Design a binder for this molecule. Structure first.
Ligand SMILES: O=C(NS(=O)(=O)c1ccc(NCCSc2ccccc2)c([N+](=O)[O-])c1)c1ccc(-c2ccc3sc(CCc4ccccc4)nc3c2)cc1
Length: 181
């Protein structure tokens, strides 16, 4: 008997990773062929879920916790001889005190920095690794958690764009009340 999980989480590591990379100037990728059509009106077009949410939180994280993050990225020096263990360790402590969206996003970034550091050392080859190491920890040290707090749908409904605006809707309203009161 055996069993596994989904892949969504993994998609986050890739999508985000790329973002953290592009933000630094890097990128790298490839193309291919499949099969599809279209006939309406092409344009940027954007979503409004984990993708957008995750990113934002990431940028704001290093902003509010510029130090809390920096000091972290300096706690682990990824290398070819580095063992996935040395990784799951550092991330463990930062996650020792229970689990909360905050630490979650604050964590994701940790990895992003690792990649930025790898490329800086002309070792982008690592990116692929750290990327897999995350999807492994997120599915063995978070999955069970994220599924106990309403998955991501909740994270995007709390500390997310559509959510941010939603919050204001109320406030701007409440204030109007006391005023008319
Ligand atoms: O912010 C946090 N929590 S929150 O109140 O739930 C929150 C606060 C703000 C936001 N968003 C607004 C932007 S700020 C932000 C901050 C964090 C995440 C996302 C956003 C969000 N959120 O979006 O989910 C959540 C938060 C922020 C930082 C840390 C944090 C920082 C450094 C370290 S170093 C360490 C172990 C050391 C150690 C290292 C190695 C080896 C051994 C020991 N553990 C750490 C934990 C822990 C929690």
């Amino acid at each position: 008997m055996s069993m596994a999980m989904s892949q969504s989480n993994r998609e986050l590591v890739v999508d985000f990773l790329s973002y953290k990379l592009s933000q630094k100037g890097y990128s790298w990728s490839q193309f291919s062929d499949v099969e599809e059509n279209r006939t309406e009106a092409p344009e940027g077009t954007e979503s409004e879920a984990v993708k957008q949410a995750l990113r934002e939180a990431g940028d704001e994280f290093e902003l509010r916790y510029r130090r809390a993050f920096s000091d972290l990225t300096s706690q682990l020096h990824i290398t070819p001889g580095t063992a996935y263990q040395s990784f799951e360790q550092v991330v463990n402590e930062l996650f020792r005190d229970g689990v909360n969206w905050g630490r979650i996003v604050a964590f994701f970034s940790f990895g992003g920095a690792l990649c930025v550091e790898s490329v800086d050392k002309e070792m982008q080859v690592l990116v692929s690794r750290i990327a897999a190491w995350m999807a492994t920890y997120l599915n063995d040290h978070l999955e069970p958690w994220i599924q106990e707090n309403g998955g991501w749908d909740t994270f995007v409904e709390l500390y997310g764009n559509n959510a941010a605006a939603e919050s204001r809707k109320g406030q701007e309203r409440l204030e109007h009340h006391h005023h008319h009161h």
